Amino acid sequence: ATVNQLVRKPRARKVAKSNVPALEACPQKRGVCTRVYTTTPKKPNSALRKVCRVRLTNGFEVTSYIGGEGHNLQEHSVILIRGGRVKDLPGVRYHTVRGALDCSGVKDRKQARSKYGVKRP
Amino acid sequence: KADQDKMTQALVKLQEEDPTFHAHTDEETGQVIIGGMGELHLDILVDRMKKEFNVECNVGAPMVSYRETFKSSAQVQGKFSRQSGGRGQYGDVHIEFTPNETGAGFEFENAIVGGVVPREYIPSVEAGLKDAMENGVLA
Amino acid sequence: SMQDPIADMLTRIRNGQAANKAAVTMPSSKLKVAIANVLKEEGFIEDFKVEGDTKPELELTLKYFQGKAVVESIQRVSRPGLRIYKRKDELPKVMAGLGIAVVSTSKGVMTDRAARQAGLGGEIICYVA
RNA sequence: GUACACACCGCCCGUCACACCAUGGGAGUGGGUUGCAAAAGAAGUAGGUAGCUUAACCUUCGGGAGGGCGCUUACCACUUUGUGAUUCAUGACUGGGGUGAAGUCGUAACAAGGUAACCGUAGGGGAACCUGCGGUUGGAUCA
RNA sequence: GCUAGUAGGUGGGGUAACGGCUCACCUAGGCGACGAUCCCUAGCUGGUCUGAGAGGAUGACCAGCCACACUGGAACUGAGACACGGUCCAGACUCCUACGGGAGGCAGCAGUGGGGAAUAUUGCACAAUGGGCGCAAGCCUGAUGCAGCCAUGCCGCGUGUAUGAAGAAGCCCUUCGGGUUGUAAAGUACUUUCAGCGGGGAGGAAGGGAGUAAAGUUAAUACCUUUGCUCAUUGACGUUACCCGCAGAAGAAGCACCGGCUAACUCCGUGCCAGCAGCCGCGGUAAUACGGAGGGUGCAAGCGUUAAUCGGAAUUACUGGGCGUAAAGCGCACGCAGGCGGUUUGUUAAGUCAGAUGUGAAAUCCCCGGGCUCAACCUGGGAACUGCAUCUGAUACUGGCAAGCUUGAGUCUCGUAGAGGGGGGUAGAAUUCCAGGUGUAGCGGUGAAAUGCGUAGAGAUCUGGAGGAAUACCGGUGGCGAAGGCGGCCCCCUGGACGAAGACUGACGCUCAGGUGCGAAAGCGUGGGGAGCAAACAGGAUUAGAUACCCUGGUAGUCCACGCCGUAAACGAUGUCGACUUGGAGGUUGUGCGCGUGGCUUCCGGAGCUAACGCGUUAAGUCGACCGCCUGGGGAGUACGGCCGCA
RNA sequence: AAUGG
Ligand SMILES: [K+]
Ligand SMILES: [K+]
Ligand SMILES: [K+]
Ligand SMILES: [K+]
Ligand SMILES: [K+]
Ligand SMILES: [K+]
Ligand SMILES: [K+]
Ligand SMILES: [K+]
Ligand SMILES: [K+]
Ligand SMILES: [K+]
Ligand SMILES: [K+]
Ligand SMILES: [Mg+2]
Ligand SMILES: [Mg+2]
Ligand SMILES: [Mg+2]
Ligand SMILES: [Mg+2]
Ligand SMILES: [Mg+2]
Ligand SMILES: [Mg+2]
Ligand SMILES: [Mg+2]
Ligand SMILES: [Mg+2]
Ligand SMILES: [Mg+2]
Ligand SMILES: [Mg+2]
Ligand SMILES: [Mg+2]
Ligand SMILES: [Mg+2]
Ligand SMILES: [Mg+2]
Ligand SMILES: [Mg+2]
Ligand SMILES: [Mg+2]
Ligand SMILES: [Mg+2]
Ligand SMILES: [Mg+2]
Ligand SMILES: [Mg+2]
Ligand SMILES: [Mg+2]
Ligand SMILES: [Mg+2]
Ligand SMILES: [Mg+2]
Ligand SMILES: [Mg+2]
Ligand SMILES: [Mg+2]
């Protein structure tokens, strides 16, 4: 680009879109579970990972991963979601915060308890 | 459906105000069931939701989850074969479905003799049955 | 078409040094002769000579050291497309002083060193190191 | 030569089936903003003055001056009407796209890939594609 | 494209004042590609965050400025308002009522409901600072000073110190020997911050009073004022900061992580499950990756996670990037605006440069110092604020102006080569067809066949005729053209290029958004033409199938005139112009004297360049001018909108 | 110069 060309049209930056649009620049967001189900990961991984469609207070419905082993989440449950995609689950871009609101902590957890909402044993 | 959101909030508040008022969702039927100390009680609660909470709701008899069972004992063979397109898949199993004592539950028996069915495939056989039994065989 | 004769001179010098040419010739001009004088006094060129009246021709005799061109670099700074004028405080230091920068000042075409002493800035013609 | 490297028992394309996501079109349906053409005219201010009334000044003591009220006009807010523009939401149904199984149908490309491939265009066909016309080498082969 | 009080003028009115501010009249202006108008978004700044910097992001708290006060209007009063806690009108909404009528505006401080992931007490004092009123005393002050809550941040500190080895127990590992946990423990000495208890006790307090004396004051020594002097008092915080004593180690450690990136590894579960996961990836018989345990590592009253900004990212490259094959040269050209421009003299000084002066709030940042026990924090001074004005100079370059000059560019004179273009005419070969003759059973086709053709005489051969399309050989890394393209021969009209030797003009140039023109094939419209060929279509084969490839047929089209379409791997995948930089071997077309000197072109190759391949005086080398264009793969050159088209 | 491997 010549200076004259740049005079006519300046250098343009990038949009830099977010990977967590539903949060709307918020650390966490409350929501209600519309369907708690399981899905299979894409190749090469293999399992039955647990997910839940959740309608946010902002009015966005998004699939959020329920981390840990076992969950007390049923339909019509008030949960707090946060940012964090699941690489092998296409579409899942959010993670439920265990131990906040209805969502209970992972039972029988002795490591990384803070990340699974488990009080000090 | 718009009221459903408001209904949730309404139930929470009502439950806090009145101890004897209870609300829960039956997982099987996927139905929120309200509990009270009488017809008059629940009537008042419902009307309060309709006005104060502005949630138009309709009450009714709680749906009942039914189960099924086999009345007769029979031996049946199940066979699969798919060689139509490229890779071929085959499997055959001879199973006897006998009525179990009520309450005992599913009791899969591996009576395979001479390894006619490979040991590795036997767990899958049970898994297949369990999944099929989870689904209705009648209604 | 030709729109920068100074850069043409600088290019001929650089191309000459690479081709190990004894001397380069070009159409003469007051500014070219001015710059030639600067290079000669700094010992970047051996000597220069202008011949002709109707069409004066400037011949620059190039100097090589240990079989290596004395001029290692000669880059035009201010160009027709982008003129560059620096103040005396903003004067550049080519190769941390080891190289020279030809600056056109009101008092005349001179090195960055000369201009800095005289307390005069101006158009930075080129950097010769 | 090559798009192969558990190395041609390689790699690899599209339809159809199923699931899911985002999205275009869509009789329309509900909002926001706004243009133009009008209508309207509270309060206030200014102007004028049918009438009505009046502390300070003047006066022949009657009045006069001046003021107020009232009325009227101009400006103008709400509001109203018609007709456009724009934007947002939503819509029976419909088009293509993306992702996912280990479904089905073929094998189009990669070797000359078994009809070299590809580009523009036209016609045709379940699909990958096929055929014509011109162009390109980003084809191999020559003993 | 926009504008009609619009743009300007004249006069009057109006304002504190200038002014289309307003009005009458006159003129037809004004604005806009240096982006008007319209649409979307938003308080601005000092500053904050990030960055080496240039920048990027951002504008809570602090300070300056602006705007706003239920919503939409409007004045009034006043020095000042079109006024948070004023008025009037209208509206929305709420409230009180005796139902006859009234009332209200937390975007002041608390506080409530609601919304949300989420943000605190309906606190104390006017002691201090500051403000209103007043003669003063004083009064008012949710300003302000303090207190409350919150790990929300920054900073400081404590949770002990020393000793303590068979180093116990236990745990864990184990090579079943030991080892590790680990001086860690226990034990033995020992000090108590901080906490708690009790005791003592700064500074923020200056003033204002009562007066008492002096001076002034004037008639007065009155009064009052001023300055000394005396005396009693003036704190919310506050049970203050801080100091002393008290006894006791008491009352004080958590969180994440250990496959690599990246500091920290084993055992045992689980067995592509259950799980993990920033990225790469792990998990199907032990998995330092999951689950749990031991041990280790990093941080610490915090530790993680999520969100967010900048950096790293030279990944929008001004600093500081690219376009032969990776994304990227418009199909080609002309040309306006624009950008840039050869050499000389004078002149100006616009840019540029120098100096002076004014300004650039404070705070903040930085530096050097102080005060807080230290730090955080507070404070003195300086530097800085990179800028913007103005005045006086310099004038090299750039710009302007004037006069120039050939070297760029162009004109004229002469000659040469060419499938350059447009129009018309004509020749030969061949195919097909038509008519006739001769002649007899095959012909034709394929990998092999078949369909098809033929005794209703084919095919072959000969003669005559018809019509359309294309031009063998020459012919070529030949030539010509901006590109697309252009090939029998002849005539007519016309473009460009190149060479030789002069003359002439005098920078007249280069590039070019927009714009305009040209632009293979296919296609489209109208009217012709139609031999051959051939999309579609039909039949025969092939094949598992064969909407194909092959065979037999065959229509549009291919041709012409005129109009439209505007695209191709329209490719050298290489924009145009100019200058410069080793060689060798060829093709083609001039010119001079076997040797030269021009134009164009092919191959090879040096330096250099390149990721490599390669390119290499016809650059992809070295530079300058200008234009176009790119910023992961898909989605997609698609959707929508506009423009164009008969489609 | 069959076709599929
Ligand atoms: K759809
Ligand atoms: K093909
Ligand atoms: K084609
Ligand atoms: K006006
Ligand atoms: K307002
Ligand atoms: K650059
Ligand atoms: K021009
Ligand atoms: K000058
Ligand atoms: K035909
Ligand atoms: K261009
Ligand atoms: K993308
Ligand atoms: Mg729609
Ligand atoms: Mg009125
Ligand atoms: Mg193929
Ligand atoms: Mg092929
Ligand atoms: Mg090919
Ligand atoms: Mg076909
Ligand atoms: Mg071509
Ligand atoms: Mg705003
Ligand atoms: Mg950058
Ligand atoms: Mg790059
Ligand atoms: Mg490319
Ligand atoms: Mg090109
Ligand atoms: Mg100047
Ligand atoms: Mg000049
Ligand atoms: Mg000619
Ligand atoms: Mg054509
Ligand atoms: Mg055919
Ligand atoms: Mg044919
Ligand atoms: Mg194109
Ligand atoms: Mg191209
Ligand atoms: Mg041009
Ligand atoms: Mg080469
Ligand atoms: Mg398109």
- Using CB atoms and an 8 Å cut-off, which of residues 71-110 of chain C contact chain A? 81-82
User: CA-to-CA distance for A34 and B4, rounded, in angstroms?
Assistant: 11
For residue B97, count CB atoms less than 10 angstroms from its CB and return exposed for 0-12, middle for 13-18, buried for 19 or more: middle
Q: Which DSSP letter does residue C53 get?
A: S
User: CA-to-CA distance for B74 and A76, rounded, in angstroms?
Assistant: 43
Distance C22 CA to E430 C1' (A): 71
Instruction: Kindly report which amino acid residue has its CA closest to the C1' atom of nucleotide E395.
Output: C106
In chain C, CATH 3.30.1490.10 covers 74-128
Find, among C49, C54, C3, the residue nearest to C26 by Cα. C49
Crossing angle for the helix pair C5-18 and C30-42, nearest 10 degrees? 40
Find, among A49, A36, A41, A53, the residue nearest to A94 by Cα. A53
Find, among B103, B99, B93, the residue nearest to B123 by Cα. B93
In chain A, the DSSP E strands lie at 28-39, 49-56, 61-65, 78-83, 94-96
Chains B and C touch (3+ CB pairs under 8 A): no
Q: Do A78 and B8 touch (CB under 8 A)?
A: yes
Tell me how many residue pairs between chain A and chain C have CB atoms under 8 A apart: 4
Give C94's contacts (C-beta < 8 A, 6+ positions apart): C100, C101, C112, C127, C128, C129
Between residue 68 and residue 97 of chain A, the positions with Cβ below 7 Å from nucleic chain E are: 68-70, 80, 82-89, 95
User: CA-to-CA distance for C7 and C13, rounded, in angstroms?
Assistant: 10
CB A116 within 8 A of CB A99: yes
Taking the CB of residue A63, how many other CB atoms lie within 10 A of it?
20
Quote the tokens at residue A52: 């839940």
Domain housing B9: 1-66
| Residue C94 backbone phi and psi in degrees, to 5 | -75, 130
For residue C32, CA distances in Å to A70, B64, C48, C56 come to: 85, 103, 10, 12
User: CA-to-CA distance for A63 and A35, rounded, in angstroms?
Assistant: 9
Quote the tokens at residue A46: 């293999």
CB A121 within 8 A of CB A110: yes
User: CA-to-CA distance for C129 and C127, rounded, in angstroms?
Assistant: 6
* Distance in Å from the first CA to the final CA of chain C: 28
Q: Which DSSP letter does residue C25 get?
A: E
In chain C, CATH 3.30.1370.30 covers 5-69
User: CA-to-CA distance for A102 and B33, rounded, in angstroms?
Assistant: 18
For residue B64, CA distances in Å to B27, B29, B30, B59, B61 come to: 12, 8, 11, 15, 9
Q: Which residues of A touch B32 (CB under 8 A)?
A: 76
Range A1-121 classified under CATH 2.40.50.140: yes
Taking the CB of residue A79, how many other CB atoms lie within 10 A of it?
23
User: CA-to-CA distance for C107 and C46, rounded, in angstroms?
Assistant: 25
Taking the CB of residue C38, how many other CB atoms lie within 10 A of it?
22
Find, among C81, B93, C117, the residue nearest to A5 by Cα. C81
Find, among A95, A94, A98, A96, the residue nearest to A116 by Cα. A98
Domain ranges of chain A: 1-121
Range C74-128 classified under CATH 3.30.1490.10: yes
User: CA-to-CA distance for C117 and C105, rounded, in angstroms?
Assistant: 12
Method: cryo-EM
Location of structure tokens 């800095």 = C116
User: CA-to-CA distance for B16 and A60, rounded, in angstroms?
Assistant: 29
Q: Which DSSP letter does residue B61 get?
A: P
Give the domain CATH number at B24: 3.30.70.870
Which 3 state secondary structure label does DSSP give B29?
A: coil
| Residue B124 backbone phi and psi in degrees, to 5 | -65, -35
CATH architecture of C5-69: 2-Layer Sandwich (3.30)
User: CA-to-CA distance for B61 and A13, rounded, in angstroms?
Assistant: 62
Taking the CA of residue A84 and the nearest CA in chain B, the distance in Å comes to: 26
What was the resolution (in A) of this experimentally determined structure? 2.2
User: CA-to-CA distance for C68 and A48, rounded, in angstroms?
Assistant: 73
User: CA-to-CA distance for A83 and A99, rounded, in angstroms?
Assistant: 16
Give A26's contacts (C-beta < 8 A, 6+ positions apart): none
Quote the tokens at residue C105: 């000042």
DSSP string of B70-92, one letter each residue: --S-EEEEEEEEE-SSSS-EEEE
User: CA-to-CA distance for A109 and A118, rounded, in angstroms?
Assistant: 7
Q: Does the nearest atom of strand E lie within 7 Å of A117's Cβ?
A: no
Chain A residue set in contact with B, beta carbons under 8 Å: 32, 74-76, 78
Taking the CB of residue C77, how many other CB atoms lie within 10 A of it?
18
Find, among C121, C110, C115, the residue nearest to C42 by Cα. C110
| Region of residue A117 (phi > 0: left; psi between -120 and 50: alpha; otherwise: beta) | left
